[PDB]
Design a protein around this nucleic acid. Structure first.
Lengths: 202, 116, 60, 127, 97, 155, 82
RNA sequence: AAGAACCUUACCAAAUCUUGACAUCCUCUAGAGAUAGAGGACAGGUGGUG
RNA sequence: UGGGCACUCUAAGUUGACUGCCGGUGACAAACCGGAGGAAGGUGGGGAUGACGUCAAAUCAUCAUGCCCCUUAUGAUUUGGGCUACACACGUGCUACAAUGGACAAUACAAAGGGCAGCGAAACCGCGAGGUCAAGCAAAUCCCAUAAAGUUGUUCUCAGUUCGGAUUGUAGUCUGCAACUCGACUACAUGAAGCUGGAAUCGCUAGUAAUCGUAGAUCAGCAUGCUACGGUGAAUACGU
């Protein structure tokens, strides 16, 4: 146990909560509704480049703001796809008509998208060194002040767990006045699970 | 001396009378409410007429011998019918249900150690 | 074992002293809070992302 | 003619009201020798009354709440010094020389995790 | 007339301390100043480790900030404009009325 | 320690006799933060020794303290298989700390009924060059007397 | 234990198989699982095969045993020394 | 383990069950009580290897 | 209490402590010593923050997971028992071995929290646990709630005792379908070891060591455990 979670450390100071609502009572059911929506979103919007999911609640209505790197894939050809998402969520408990899609223009500048992109290639028998270096190269080319990447566990199919970590630029994880996007992803391979961590600082 | 059990002299009545088996402090304070004794006079400064008043009250309670006999037949009954409390009495173990694994000395008695 | 004790806890027991609390996210039967219905582990992971409203690290 | 000089010590706040007059010290509408159990607290209370000569010249109408008695006594003492300057502001030339205008920050310590309560540690043996 | 607001974030309760006194002064009405009410801190202490490593505890807080604003001259244009609450979906409103 | 010197925490004069020495004696009698008793212990003994001797309570105390305070201590050096007991003269500040400590410790070790009478008994005995408190300094001097041959080993 | 308002406790099915046979002369060896039932005064001259956890130890109920639960008369643990 | 009378209990003895305790599509009567009578690919495993 | 909101609090913003300054030692420069304000002076004090790596350290029993097996069992529902068993040894604490104390009565001074079918006042009954009725409070508004050590007097007069409260007997209170295994308590009776702990050993240089109570998480009920909160509160620290 060495590194504190970058997101948890900076939440409330410079970062903001995803679940933004108040519940003096019924907090347990309202919170578990958030996870129930998020978990359903996770598998339904799997191949869509979904990075963050914000659930807001006001006047017995659930507001969902889904930040995606592939708008239109979620929305559909004018709204057909998002309609199925809305009504499928709508069937669960109350009504949640508000769904807002936010475009993520720099997909390679998002930690969750970069980590997921790395993890999916790793599952398809790819070099654990090439995926890190190429992804790192793209982010630095996009103006990021610094990017750090780490892939752990049976690198290349070996019988012993290792951890390949490559870094470029400046990634100060000790400074609090700095927004470092951190995300962890898993790549289930034939030899076992992999651990991907990305530290994109802009 | 009350009914055969001599109490320590040069002591206050409320304190000296607890030396009798079967009588404690709370019971002793009860005597001085009935018998008109100031609870501060020494047994050696006590007056014989005060002794009579005290002695009349004492036998009303289960004072001596009887309380010893009562407590024994209660345990003896537990021994005869072989309950949880009463079998542990035979083996000298805490009968309430305390932990006998490491800390039970006023029931086990002396520490007869086994070497390793 | 899991998936049987979880359903048993979900199932209404006969009396009011038979039911217990399990972490609805993972099923842990120990150290489960009541304001969040979450174990000490699931509390840490969800509070780190910020999915529990208003919960932040205390530094007093 | 109340010279309001505030004073805080530990978890106590004293509302010192200096008023002219030779008389006793009335802590929470009570004599200082009936309020404070010990005289040593009453000596520490009159420290700024003695450093600059104004002993007993004021009837301190103090409204103290919080803490025990030593915390309240020094909160009054600190409040008295912050009120002696409220009467005459040419008094600091000896109050700073004796350190009476400074809020003492020697407040208690956190119960440090991993260590037994405060800065001390539990028993340690070798296996 | 006792409008009170509770919020987990102090910034949205400071913004909620305002923005309703301004809709109170939108009509002709006197409103009392935002009363700073004591916040309620809930402290949680959990073991960081997933098993046995005790004495290593992660401490979390949750501060519910509170405000009190009192309308002193309730005009009809205030009861109609009382629905203009710009709640950011996370600021609880309790108008005692 | 290693880095320079440590400033010491000071005391205020006694409420009654106006002596910083008297207040520090209270700080020694005190157990478990109980000032109340310690303050009562001394005043029940200062006012008691006045009835025994006759002179002022603080006047006898000042005389007694002088007869407990040590003049020459014995600090330990080391050359090897022999430990050098090097006699070192006591600095004035440590003398009062030792004199007050030996008054309390050798009053506790005695006994008649209570602590106040023991303290008062030891106070008068010290002014008369008797008691354990003055027997501790007589042994402290004696060890300093014997080991004058190690005087020049004073670091 | 219990109270004076609540009174004594016997399992809702246990006494039913006691006042079932009391109109007959012969006592029975009723198998029992409720160790928590108070031995009632009507429990007299009756063998109760109380479950200790693995077996049904029988117990002839005398007057003195009224007051304690039959669980006190069924040894659960076994110990033969060290 | 920040909570062992039942539960928790993952352990043991009895009463039991096998598409299952759970997916995914296809009011009375005995009886400790469960439960009983009347008013199919699949699951699962606190099983093992930190 | 009317009235004010003055003081204090409450919580938002905003000043301040930056070697700015004044000297003097280094002008190889950094730096260092003392002084001045100033509430705070030299990273002002505490918290969070734990690099490369180390220990194949811990966790397949939070969870997931590669592989390996069970799959009318290694799965599954119930009642009872066990997890509390006791020849003993070890670690961590609590309580005392009293007179700076026991008891007996009066008499003060906090902080921090929690609370909706919860906190539960006031009254009444009971020796007491507690029970019956209950106001108010979704709470800076009502309740937990009273801090206790502390102060003042009286009593004991060094004694295994008016210290100590382990252990048993009896009769009860609450919670729970159900306190036997194996709950917390309350009364009356009893009254153990223990007269300050050997060799060894740990902690600490301030509001610390020591000492007194309060609160919370879990929780039908159950803490000498843990986490927090305050009250009283030492002192030499020359020196390497």
């Amino acid at each position: 146990g060495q590194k504190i979670n970058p997101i948890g450390l900076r939440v409330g100071i410079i970062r903001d909560w995803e679940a933004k609502w108040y519940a003096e009572k019924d907090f347990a059911s309202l919170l578990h509704e958030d996870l129930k929506i998020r978990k359903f979103i996770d598998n339904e919007l799997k191949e869509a480049s979904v990075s963050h999911v914000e659930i807001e609640r006001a006047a017995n209505r659930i507001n969902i703001a889904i930040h995606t790197g592939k708008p239109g894939m979620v929305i559909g050809k004018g709204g057909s796809e998002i309609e199925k998402l809305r009504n499928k969520l709508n069937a669960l408990t109350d009504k949640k008509v508000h769904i807002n899609v936010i475009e993520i223009k720099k997909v390679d500048l998002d930690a969750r998208l970069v980590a997921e992109n790395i993890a999916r290639q790793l599952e398809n028998r790819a070099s654990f060194r090439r995926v890190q270096k190429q992804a790192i190269t793209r982010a630095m080319k996009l103006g990021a002040k610094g990017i750090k990447t780490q892939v752990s566990g049976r690198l290349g199919g070996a019988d012993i767990a290792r951890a390949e970590q490559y870094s470029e630029g400046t990634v100060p994880l000790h400074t609090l006045r700095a927004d470092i996007d951190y995300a962890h992803a898993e790549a289930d391979t034939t030899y076992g699970k992999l651990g991907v961590k990305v530290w994109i600082y802009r | 001396r009350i009914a055969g059990v001599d109490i320590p002299r040069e002591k206050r009545v409320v304190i000296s009378l607890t030396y009798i088996y079967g009588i404690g402090t709370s019971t002793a304070q009860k005597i001085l409410e009935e018998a008109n004794v100031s609870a501060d006079t020494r047994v050696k400064d006590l007056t014989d007429d005060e002794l009579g008043r005290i002695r009349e009250v004492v036998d009303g309670y289960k004072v001596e011998g009887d309380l010893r006999r009562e407590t024994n037949l209660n345990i003896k009954r537990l021994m005869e019918i072989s309950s949880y409390r009463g079998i542990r009495h035979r083996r000298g173990l805490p009968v309430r249900g305390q932990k006998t694994k490491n800390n039970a000395r006023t029931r086990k008695g002396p520490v007869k150690t086994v070497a390793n | 074992a899991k998936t049987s004790m979880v359903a048993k806890q979900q199932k209404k027991q006969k009396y009011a002293v038979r039911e217990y609390t399990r972490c609805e996210r993972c099923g842990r039967p120990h150290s489960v809070y009541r304001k969040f219905k979450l174990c000490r582990i699931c509390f840490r992971e969800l509070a780190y992302k910020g999915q529990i409203p208003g919960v932040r690290k205390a530094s007093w | 003619v109340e010279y309001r000089g505030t004073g805080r010590r530990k978890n106590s706040v004293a509302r010192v009201r200096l008023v002219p007059g030779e008389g006793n010290i009335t802590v929470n509408n009570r004599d200082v020798r009936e309020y404070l159990p010990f005289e040593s607290l009453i000596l520490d209370l009159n420290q700024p009354f003695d450093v600059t000569e104004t002993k007993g010249n004021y009837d301190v109408l103090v409204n103290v709440h919080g803490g025990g008695f030593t915390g309240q006594a020094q909160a009054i003492r600190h409040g008295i010094a912050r009120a002696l300057l409220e009467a005459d502001p040419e008094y600091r030339g000896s109050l700073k020389r004796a350190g009476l205008l400074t809020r003492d920050p020697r407040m208690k310590e956190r119960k440090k995790p991993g260590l037994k309560a405060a800065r001390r540690s539990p028993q340690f043996s070798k296996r | 007339i006792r409008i009170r607001l509770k919020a987990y974030d102090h910034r949205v309760i400071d913004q909620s301390a305002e923005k309703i006194v301004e809709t109170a002064k939108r009509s002709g009405a006197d409103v009392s100043g935002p009363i700073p009410l004591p916040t309620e801190k809930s402290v949680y202490t959990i073991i960081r480790a997933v098993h046995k490593y005790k004495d290593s505890r992660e401490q979390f807080e949750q501060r519910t900030h509170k405000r009190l604003i009192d309308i002193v001259n309730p005009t009809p244009k205030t009861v109609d404009a009382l629905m203009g609450l710009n709640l950011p979906s996370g600021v609880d409103i309790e108008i005692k009325l | 320690p290693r880095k320079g010197s440590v400033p010491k925490r000071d005391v205020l004069p006694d409420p009654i006799h106006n002596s910083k020495l008297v207040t520090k004696l209270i700080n020694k009698i005190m157990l478990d933060g109980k000032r109340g008793t310690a303050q009562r212990i001394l005043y029940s003994a200062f006012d008691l020794v006045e009835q025994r001797s006759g002179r002022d309570a603080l006047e006898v105390f000042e005389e007694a303290i002088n007869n407990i305070m040590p003049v020459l201590e014995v600090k330990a050096r080391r050359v090897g298989g022999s430990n050098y007991q090097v006699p070192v003269e006591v600095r004035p500040e440590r003398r009062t700390t030792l004199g007050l400590r030996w008054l309390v410790n050798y009053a506790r070790l005695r006994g008649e009924k209570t602590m106040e009478d023991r303290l008062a008994n030891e106070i008068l005995d010290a002014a008369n060059n008797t008691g354990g408190a003055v027997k501790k300094r007589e042994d402290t001097h004696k060890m300093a007397e014997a080991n004058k041959a190690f005087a020049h080993y004073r670091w | 234990a219990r109270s004076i308002k609540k009174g004594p406790f016997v399992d809702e099915h246990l006494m039913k198989k006691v006042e079932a046979q009391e109109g007959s002369e012969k006592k029975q060896v009723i198998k029992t699982w409720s160790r928590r039932s108070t031995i009632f005064p009507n429990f007299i001259g009756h063998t109760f095969a109380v479950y200790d956890g693995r077996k049904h130890v029988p117990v002839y109920v005398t007057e003195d045993m009224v007051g304690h639960k039959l669980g006190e008369f069924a040894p659960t643990r076994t110990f033969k020394g060290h």
